[PDB]
Amino acid sequence: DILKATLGQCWAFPPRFSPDTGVSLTAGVEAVMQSLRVLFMTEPGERIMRESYGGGMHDFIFENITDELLANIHNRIEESILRHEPRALLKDVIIQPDKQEASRLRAQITVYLANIHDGQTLRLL
Template structure:
């Protein structure tokens, strides 16, 4: 059994087509898991009509003071979202790199184990205030 296929294959996001083959571009394996995590972390609650409880709602925290309480809350929010919406992995750790916080950026590093293969992987999600983001 091909591990990448078992882990899942999905549309690339945003969806697009390969001009040479005229085929839909897809992702599989660890890349698919990382893309799924990226989508989960960047989705607001209520944004998906058929799944109003899907998402992480990190954007509501953009202008909060970055203290220990908020850092703990962000980690808990992410861990809970992954627990409910990414069943292919077990989260090992979530760390926040705040070295660039004065520029409005936090790097969220998620280390996880893929359940079916017991292999370790990680992804880094840049969480920051976009220029177009309203207060």
């Protein structure tokens, strides 16, 4: 209930309208995840008078997974969460090519709400 208070309330990203309930509203922790789908599905220039706002992932669509690409995707995600969504940190973003039916890059972006492992010596030479 307090997460709905501290994190703001706003509309759902696919605008669903009904005569019974006026506007469907996403609130709280679901509102932060709703804004992160907005950011990476937008593209800079597509919002009038807001040209800074966008994820920019269309830069990487014919770019050969060669691991110069996967560092560029990591930095574009990390920067755009800084500029346009400081309500949610970043934990890690893991990018893998799809093993079945390749040429799909799958990125799992893990956020926050906002020791050297000594045991491995007993399993090495």
